Scaffold this motif. Sequence first.
Motif, mmCIF file in Angstrom:
data_model
loop_
_atom_site.group_PDB
_atom_site.id
_atom_site.type_symbol
_atom_site.label_atom_id
_atom_site.label_comp_id
_atom_site.label_asym_id
_atom_site.label_seq_id
_atom_site.Cartn_x
_atom_site.Cartn_y
_atom_site.Cartn_z
ATOM 1 N N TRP B 31 46.802 51.214 -6.750
ATOM 2 C CA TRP B 31 47.160 51.958 -7.949
ATOM 3 C C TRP B 31 45.970 52.879 -8.298
ATOM 4 C CZ3 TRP B 31 47.029 46.884 -6.938
ATOM 5 C CH2 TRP B 31 46.050 46.083 -7.535
ATOM 6 N N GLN B 32 45.437 52.653 -9.499
ATOM 7 C CA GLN B 32 44.296 53.321 -10.111
ATOM 8 C C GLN B 32 44.487 54.845 -10.125
ATOM 9 O OE1 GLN B 32 40.521 51.483 -10.608
ATOM 10 N NE2 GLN B 32 40.766 53.176 -12.062
ATOM 11 N N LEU B 33 45.565 55.209 -10.791
ATOM 12 C CA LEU B 33 45.938 56.583 -11.083
ATOM 13 C C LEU B 33 44.770 57.221 -11.796
ATOM 14 C CD1 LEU B 33 48.108 58.253 -10.227
ATOM 15 C CD2 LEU B 33 49.464 57.344 -12.121
ATOM 16 N N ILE B 34 44.231 58.296 -11.257
ATOM 17 C CA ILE B 34 43.069 58.866 -11.924
ATOM 18 C C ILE B 34 43.446 59.963 -12.919
ATOM 19 C CG2 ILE B 34 40.881 60.021 -11.234
ATOM 20 C CD1 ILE B 34 41.656 58.139 -8.569
ATOM 21 N N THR B 35 44.651 60.535 -12.790
ATOM 22 C CA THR B 35 45.249 61.597 -13.611
ATOM 23 C C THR B 35 44.805 61.739 -15.058
ATOM 24 N N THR B 36 45.489 61.099 -16.009
ATOM 25 C CA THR B 36 44.995 61.246 -17.374
ATOM 26 C C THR B 36 44.791 60.040 -18.273
ATOM 27 O OG1 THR B 36 47.205 61.701 -18.335
ATOM 28 C CG2 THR B 36 45.832 63.632 -17.696
ATOM 29 N N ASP B 37 45.903 59.521 -18.792
ATOM 30 C CA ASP B 37 45.872 58.462 -19.784
ATOM 31 C C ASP B 37 46.311 57.039 -19.450
ATOM 32 O OD1 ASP B 37 48.166 59.858 -19.323
ATOM 33 O OD2 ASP B 37 48.843 59.854 -21.390
ATOM 34 N N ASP B 38 46.840 56.705 -18.266
ATOM 35 C CA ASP B 38 47.257 55.307 -18.111
ATOM 36 C C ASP B 38 46.071 54.351 -18.096
ATOM 37 O OD1 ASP B 38 46.420 56.081 -15.597
ATOM 38 O OD2 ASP B 38 48.231 55.340 -14.584
ATOM 39 N N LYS B 39 45.148 54.516 -17.135
ATOM 40 C CA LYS B 39 43.914 53.740 -16.960
ATOM 41 C C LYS B 39 44.187 52.256 -16.637
ATOM 42 C CE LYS B 39 41.755 52.625 -20.608
ATOM 43 N NZ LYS B 39 41.121 52.699 -21.957
ATOM 44 N N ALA B 40 45.440 51.837 -16.708
ATOM 45 C CA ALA B 40 45.847 50.470 -16.500
ATOM 46 C C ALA B 40 46.945 50.434 -15.448
ATOM 47 N N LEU B 41 47.023 49.350 -14.661
ATOM 48 C CA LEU B 41 46.206 48.133 -14.730
ATOM 49 C C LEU B 41 46.400 47.487 -13.346
ATOM 50 C CD1 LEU B 41 44.415 46.447 -16.623
ATOM 51 C CD2 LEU B 41 46.490 45.407 -17.566
ATOM 52 N N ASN B 42 45.799 46.311 -13.150
ATOM 53 C CA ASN B 42 45.892 45.461 -11.968
ATOM 54 C C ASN B 42 47.352 45.116 -11.667
ATOM 55 O OD1 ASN B 42 45.364 43.657 -9.889
ATOM 56 N ND2 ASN B 42 43.970 42.371 -11.062
ATOM 57 N N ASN B 43 47.621 44.775 -10.388
ATOM 58 C CA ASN B 43 48.978 44.476 -9.918
ATOM 59 C C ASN B 43 49.621 43.381 -10.764
ATOM 60 O OD1 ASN B 43 47.470 42.280 -8.721
ATOM 61 N ND2 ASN B 43 48.835 42.184 -6.963
ATOM 62 N N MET B 44 50.740 43.746 -11.348
ATOM 63 C CA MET B 44 51.446 42.926 -12.305
ATOM 64 C C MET B 44 52.304 41.845 -11.650
ATOM 65 S SD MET B 44 51.777 46.414 -14.494
ATOM 66 C CE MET B 44 50.190 47.204 -14.756
ATOM 67 N N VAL G 1 36.637 62.843 -26.499
ATOM 68 C CA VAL G 1 36.159 63.111 -25.153
ATOM 69 C C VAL G 1 36.959 62.218 -24.197
ATOM 70 C CG1 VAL G 1 34.311 61.390 -25.189
ATOM 71 C CG2 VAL G 1 34.028 63.508 -23.818
ATOM 72 N N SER G 2 37.708 61.292 -24.776
ATOM 73 C CA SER G 2 38.527 60.370 -23.997
ATOM 74 C C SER G 2 39.746 61.080 -23.433
ATOM 75 C CB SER G 2 38.983 59.191 -24.836
ATOM 76 O OG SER G 2 39.833 58.354 -24.068
ATOM 77 N N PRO G 3 39.961 61.038 -22.103
ATOM 78 C CA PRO G 3 41.118 61.705 -21.467
ATOM 79 C C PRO G 3 42.456 61.388 -22.102
ATOM 80 C CG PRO G 3 39.632 60.852 -19.814
ATOM 81 C CD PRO G 3 39.112 60.347 -21.121
ATOM 82 N N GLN G 4 42.613 60.153 -22.580
ATOM 83 C CA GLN G 4 43.827 59.727 -23.265
ATOM 84 C C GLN G 4 44.015 60.561 -24.516
ATOM 85 O OE1 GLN G 4 41.338 57.882 -22.183
ATOM 86 N NE2 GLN G 4 42.208 56.495 -20.647
ATOM 87 N N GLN G 5 42.992 60.567 -25.367
ATOM 88 C CA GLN G 5 43.027 61.372 -26.571
ATOM 89 C C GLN G 5 43.019 62.858 -26.263
ATOM 90 O OE1 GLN G 5 43.589 60.373 -29.625
ATOM 91 N NE2 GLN G 5 43.835 58.293 -28.823
#
Lengths: 59, 181, 194, 295, 159, 527, 218
Positions: B31-44, G1-5
Amino acid sequence: VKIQPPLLRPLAYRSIKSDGLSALAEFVGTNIGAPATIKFLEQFDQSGVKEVIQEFKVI
Amino acid sequence: LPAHLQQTFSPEEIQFIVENEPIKIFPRITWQLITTDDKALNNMVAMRSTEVVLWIALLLKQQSKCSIVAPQWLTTKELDRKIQYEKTHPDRFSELPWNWLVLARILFNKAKDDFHDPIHELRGKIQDLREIRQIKVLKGLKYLNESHLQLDNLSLLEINELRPFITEIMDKLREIHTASL
Amino acid sequence: MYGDLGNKLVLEAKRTKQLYARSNQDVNLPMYHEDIIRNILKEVSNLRKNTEYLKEQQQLGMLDDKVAKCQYFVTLLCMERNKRCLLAYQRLRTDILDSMAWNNNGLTNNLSHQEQEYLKEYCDLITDLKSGDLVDIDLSGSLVPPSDVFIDVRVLKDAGETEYGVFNLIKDSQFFVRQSDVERLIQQGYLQKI
Amino acid sequence: LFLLRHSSLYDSFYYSNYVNAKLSLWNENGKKRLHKMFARMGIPLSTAQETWLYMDHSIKRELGIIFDKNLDRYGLQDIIRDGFVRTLGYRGSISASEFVEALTALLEVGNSAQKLTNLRKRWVSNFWLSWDALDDRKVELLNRGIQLAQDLQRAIFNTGVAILEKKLIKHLRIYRLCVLQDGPDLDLYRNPLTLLRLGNWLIECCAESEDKQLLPMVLASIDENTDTYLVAGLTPRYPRGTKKPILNNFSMAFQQITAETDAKVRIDNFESSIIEIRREDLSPFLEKLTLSGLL
Amino acid sequence: YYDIDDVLADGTEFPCKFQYDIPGLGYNPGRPITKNTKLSLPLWLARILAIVGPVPFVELLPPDMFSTKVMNAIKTDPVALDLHSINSHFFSLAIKWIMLFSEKELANVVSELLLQRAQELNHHASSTSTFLLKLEEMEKEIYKKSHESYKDTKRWMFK
Amino acid sequence: DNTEIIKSFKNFILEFRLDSQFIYRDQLRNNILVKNYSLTVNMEHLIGYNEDIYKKLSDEPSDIIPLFETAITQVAKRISILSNSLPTFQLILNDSEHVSKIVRLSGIIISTSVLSSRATYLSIMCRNCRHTTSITINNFNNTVSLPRSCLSTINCGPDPYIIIHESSKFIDQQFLKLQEIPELVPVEMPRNLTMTCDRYLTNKVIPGTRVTIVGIYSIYNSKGVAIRTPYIKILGIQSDEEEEEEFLQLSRNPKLYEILTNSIAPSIFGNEDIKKAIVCLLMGGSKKILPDGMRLRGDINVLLLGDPGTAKSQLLKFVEKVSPIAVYTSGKGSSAAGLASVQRPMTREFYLEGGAMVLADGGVVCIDEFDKMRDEDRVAIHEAMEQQTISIAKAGITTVLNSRTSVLAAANPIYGRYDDLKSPGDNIDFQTTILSRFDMIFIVKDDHNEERDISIANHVINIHTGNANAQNQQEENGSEISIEKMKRYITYCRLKCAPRLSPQAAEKLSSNFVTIRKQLLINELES
Amino acid sequence: VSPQQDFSDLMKSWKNERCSPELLPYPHQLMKRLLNRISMQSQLENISMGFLDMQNESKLPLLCMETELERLKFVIRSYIRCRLSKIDKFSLYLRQLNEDENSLISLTDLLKDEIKYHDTHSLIWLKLVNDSILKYMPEELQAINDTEGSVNMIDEPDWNKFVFIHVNGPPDGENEFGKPCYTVIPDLKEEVELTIGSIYVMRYEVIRDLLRDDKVAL
Ligand SMILES: Nc1ncnc2c1ncn2[C@@H]1O[C@H](COP(=O)(O)OP(=O)(O)OP(O)(O)=S)[C@@H](O)[C@H]1O
C-alpha cells in the motif's frame, strides 16, 4: 500544429540526453502524422543523430 | 472557458466533491499511497470495519475486494420518523445527512447486495420524503424577499439546482428598492 | 433610422447567442458585414466634419451660442452609441472565437482577416501559457472529472494510426481503454462512444 | 410455431415454416384446411386477428388443451416442448428462440470491387449494432428489429409462392438444381444468411419428406458487379424419421473445380459453402458439378 | 455598456417634449422646432438631455406605458397580464425611468408583481399554453437556465 | 370491496417500479404543477402490470370509472397540499359483440356540436321545511333522480327539491359526430354515429382529420318496439423540439429547392415548372396588417389548362394529400360535394351549416374542370380568392365572414391541342378577367422526342412493374425521407418565419415590371 | 503544512474561488509548494518503469496514485482557468485598480501567469479593437475608459450582489455572544443574524470581511 511533448518523450525514450531529445522533439514538431510521427522518428555519435533528425522563379 | 454553469456547480462536479467522503468498509484482505491525505494504513483484517474515502471504496467494490457496511443512519424506520416529523413541521426541514441523495444513488448501484430488502421499500420512502421536502421548499419560497432567505436544512444537490432562480431574482429586488432612494 | 445600423448588428449578435444556445456547438459565424460598418463610418465622418466645421465657424457667425453646444453634445453621445454597438458586437464576436480557440485545441474563411490575426496571436499566446505550465496544464481541455478509470470507446473514421505504445487504430473497432489516450484522440474527433 | 408472442396466431401459422409444406399454405387447398383447424379450435376469425395481449384469459389457459384436442388431426402431435422462458418481470417473458430470430434479423437489416467491399464494410458496421443490441435494458432498438423480422418473413413466404408457381426445379437424380435469375426485391438476397434460411425454407418445403431420396438444392442470384451469382450449398433436412453421419459433400468438389482453369472465380466468401461465379462460367461449373459427381 | 440589454433598453423611443427652441432637428426642414414639441426620443439621449441646464432641457412627460390604467391593471391580476405587447422590456426599462424620475410608490408595487411572476414562472419550470409566449426577456433567459438545470438533474440521476 | 379497487390502483401508481425508475407518480407530479388536472395511462402498460386487474376493467367499464376518479383525486390531494378548488380528474387512455366494451377504433369526424354543459356537484332544498342535501354526479349518459320526500322524516311530498343554481359546479361537453372512411366498403351512402365528450378533451380537433378514437359503444333510448339509438362515448382522442434541430439543419442547405422538387411527384416525370410551382404554393407568402382598411393576400393559385392525357389529375390529387388542410374538387357536378350554406328547421330555427371554402380557409382549393362549370354560385369563387370576404344577406343571417383560401385549377381548352393552332387566345369564352385574378397560368404542350418518348415509356413501365422507380428506399436513405415529414415541416414553417422582401432587391422588380408591361405593348399595339 | 489539510484547503479554496464573483488573493505561498510536491510524486512512475526490467503484480495503488494525481490536477485546472476567465472579464477595471495607490495592488500577492496573460491579452485586445473600430477614432473618442456616461470600463466591482453563504468559524475551544450562536450588518437595515448550521443568503459586501477573515463558507 498541436502535440503533447510529455506523451512524445517516452516514445522518444526507447541513453539519450534530454537536450537532444527535446531539440529533436521541437524541430520535428511541425511535421505531424495522424500518428505517422512514430514512423518518421524510428528512422532516426551526437553529430550523426543531429544530422539524421533534420530530414525566385518564373510563373 | 467552460462557461457552464458558471455560477452553479455541475451535478457531476458536486459528485466530484462528495468523492471526498470517508466511509467504513470490510476488506477481503487479512500500500502506502504517497498521493495526498490517506496516510493509512497497514493491511486490514478481513471482514473488519475501517473508515476510508468514498472513491477508493468504489474502486475496491469494483474489484469486489471490500465488503461495504451499510450506513446505520439509513434505516426505513428512521425515515418513517423523519416523515412523521415532517408532517407536523410546516416550517422546519430538520434532518438530512446533506449528501444522502448521491449516496443512495451510488449505494443502490453496487452496495445494494449488502442491505436487507431495500428493494421496493426505502426507495419509495426517500422519493416520497424528497418530494414533500421540495414542496415545503416551495411553501417557504413564496415568502422570499430581501434580506433574509431561510436556508435551514437541505441536501446540497437541490440547493445547487435551485440556485440560479433565487440568486438572480433577489438582486433585482434589492437594486430597484435601494435604487429608488 | 439613424443609429439603425447599430440596431441591426446588435440584434444579429443577440440572435447569434440563441443560435449558439444548445446548439449543438457547430457555430460558424455567418459573416462580418463591413458594408454596414462603412455606412456607420460615413455617417460619423459627415457628422464630425460638420461638427468641426461649426466648431470653427463658432468664432465668426455662430458666436458661440449656448444652443449650438447641444448638437456637439448630442453627436458625441450618438458617436458613443455607435461605438458601443461595434464594441459589444466585436467583443461577443471575439468571445465566441475565443471559445472556439479553447475547446478544440486540441492537443472561418468567410470571417474578417483581423479576427484571424487576433486568433493566431491568441492561440500563440495560449500556447505560451501552456509552455509556462509545466504543471501540466492541459488547461484548455479535460473539462469533465474522470471516472472510473477505464472506458469503452469506438472508432470514428480513424485508421490510422501511438502515445506510450502504438495501438494500431482500426476503423470501426471498439475498445475498452483508460481515459488518457482517449482524451487526445477525441480532440480530433477520431473516437465516438464515451 | 414462429413469432408467437408478438403476433396473431393466424399470421403465426401463415408464416410458419414447419406448418408450410404439411399444410401446403402456398396453394389454396390447405387454406380451408387451416380454417378447418381453427374450426376445430372454435376460434372466430376476428378473434385470431387480435394481438396476443388483448385475447381473453379463457382462450389463453385453454390454448394447450385445445391444441392437444385439435392439431393431432393433421399429424402435429409432436410439437409441445418444455423449452425455457426468461423472466425479466414487468416487460414480459419471451422464449429464447424468438429473441434469437429477432437479433439475427437485426443482423441482416436495421443497418469495381470498391462497392462490394464497401457493402461488406456495411455488413460489419451492422454487427456492432447487434453487439450493442445484446443488452436487456436497451429495448428501444430491439423492438425495431423484432418487427422487421416480420417484414422479412413476409417477403420470404411471398417470393416462395412465386417460385412455387413456375416450378423452376430441375428434379434430377444426382441433385436438384435451381437458379433465380430474376425477380422482385432482389436487394434483400445480397446477404448470404438471407439465402441460408431461404434455402432452408425451400428444402423443408419441397421435401417433407415426401419419399424418396432427399436431394440437395442449388441457388443463386445477381444484380450488378458483373454476374456475381452467389451460390451457396444447401443440405436436406430430415423430419425426425442425425439418422446417419451424412453432414456435407461440397468442400472436396469445390476444391476439384477450383483447381481447374478457375477464371473469374472468387473464393472470397469466408464460408466454404458459398462462392461467387460468372453465369457464363457457372453453366460449365454446373456441368462439371453433375459429372463427375463426387457423391 | 457591453450588455446587449443596455443598448436594447436605451433603444426605445420616449415622447418627452423639450423646454426650449431646438435648431437642427435630428428627425422636418424647419429648421428650428418651437419649444414643447412632444417627440419620442431614445432613452440614452433623452435620459441625460434634460439633466443638463439649471432648468432642464426636456419636460419629461409621463410615459404612456406607465398610465394609471396600466399600473392598476397590473395591480389587479398579474398572472394574466401580458407585458410583451406593451413594451416588451419592462422591469429593465422601468428601473431606468424610475431612476430618472425617482418615485418610491410604484417600485414597491412592481416588486410584488415580479415576485408572483417568479412564483408562477418557476411553477411552469418543472417538467403550456399561451402564457409562456408573453414573458419578458430576462425571465425567459432564467427559464432556459432553470430548465436545463432540472433536465440535467434528473438525467444525472441515471446516465 | 369498493375501496380494494382504489387501493389496487393507488398500489399501482405508488408501488410500481421498473428497473431503477418509477414512471406514473412522476406523471402526476408533473401534471399538477403544470395545472393539467388530468392524467394519461397506457393500457398496455396496465396489461403489463397485472392480469386480474385488466379482466376486471374488461368486464364492467361503467362501474370501474369512479374508482379511477377516486384514486386520481386521493393521490392528487397529497400533491394538492404540495401544490381549495380541485375537482375529480378524468382519465384519458389510449353491433352485438360491441355493446359497452373497451374497443379502440378509427374514423373521420362528420360534425361536432357547440360546447354544452351538464352538471357535476349540486345541492337541493326542501321548499317548506328548509332541508338541504347535496349530490355529486359523473355519468351523465337515467340511473337516479330527485326524491319526493322531505327526508327529515328518514307531508311535503311530491318532489320538494329545488336545485340551487348559485352553488353548483359544471364541466363542458362537445358531442362530435363521425363519418365512415372514403376508401373502404362504401359499396352505399355514408353512415354515421354519435360521440360525446368529457372534461379536458373538449374543443380539440377542427373537423376533416383522419383519426382514431378509443371508445365505449353504449346505448341510450330518447329521440314499444325497443328502438334505441346507440353511441360511442369518447375516451382518449389522439390527433393527426428535436425536430427543430433537424429543421434548422434542413433550412440552411443550398440544395433544398431541388431536393423538394424531388419530393412532390415521384410518379410523374417531367413537368418541372409545375413541379416547382407546387413547392411555392404549399408555403404561403407574407400577410400585411396595414393602417389601410384592408389587409392583403398571401397564398397563391395554380392553373393547369392543357391537352388531355397529361395526368395533371394525379398531380392535383397528390397536392391534396400533402397539405394538412385542403379541399380537392373534381368538377362542377358531384354525387355529394357542396361549396355559404343555407339551412333553414327543428325548433323552426335558421342556422349556418358550412360549405367548402369554409373548410379550406387558410388552405388549398382544387378545382377540376374549369370550363365544365356553371355560373350559379361562381361569383363567390370570383371573390373568395381576392378580398377574403364572403357576405350573406339572406332570410336567416346578415354577417360578413372570412375565407383565407387558395384555389388550384386544371382546365381543358376546346378541341384539345388545336387551340394553339388558331389565334393563341380563344380559350375562356366569358372573358380573361378571371385569369387576371389568378397568379400562374401554364400551358402544357405535346412534342415528340423519341428519346424522351422511350424514357417516358420505360419510366412508366418501371412504375407499374418490377418496382424499379419504386430504389426509393435508398433514396429515402439519401433524400426526402417522408411525405409526413414535409407536412410537419410546413406546419413549423408557416407560423414561425415572418418573411419580407429586401430593400436592395426591390429596385430590381421595379425595373422588371416595366419590361413585362413593355412586352405586352410589343405584342399588343403593333398587332 | 499538512498534505491532508493542504488538500482540504485546496478543495476549499476551489469552491470559494468558483463561488466568489470577483478576484481573491493569489496563494503562491501554497500554490508553489503544491506544484512542486505534485511534480515530486509525479516523477516518483519510476518504480513502474523499473518494474518492466525484472522480466528476464498489484498495480492497484499505482493507478490509484496516478488517478488522484490527474484528478487533483483537474481540480487545479478548473481553478486556474476560472481565475483567468474572471480576469478577462475584469481586466480593464483591474488595471485601473492597479493605477490607484490604495489599497492592495494587483502585483503578485493578490495576483505571475495571470499578470502575463492579463497584459498580453489586453495588449492584443487593444490592437484588435484599435485597428478595427478606432481608426475612425474621433479625438474625444480616442480614450477607451470612463468618459463619464455611460460609463464604461468601470464594471463590475459589485459587492452588493446576493450569493449563498454558510456560517463556519474557528472555535474558542470571541464574537460568540449567545444564546445559540454568533454573530451580529446592513447599512440601511439591521442584523438578522446567523447560525453555524444554516445558510443565509445575503449581500456579498457585508460578508466580505468574513471571507477575508475566512469566517463564512460559500
Ligand atoms: N407520367 C404520366 N403521364 C401521363 N399520364 C400518366 C402518367 N402516369 C400515369 N398516368 C395515367 O394516365 C392518365 C392520363 O390522364 P390525365 O393525365 O389525367 O389527363 P388529363 O389531362 O388529366 O385529362 P383531364 O383529367 O380530364 S384534364 C392519368 O390519369 C393516369 O391514370
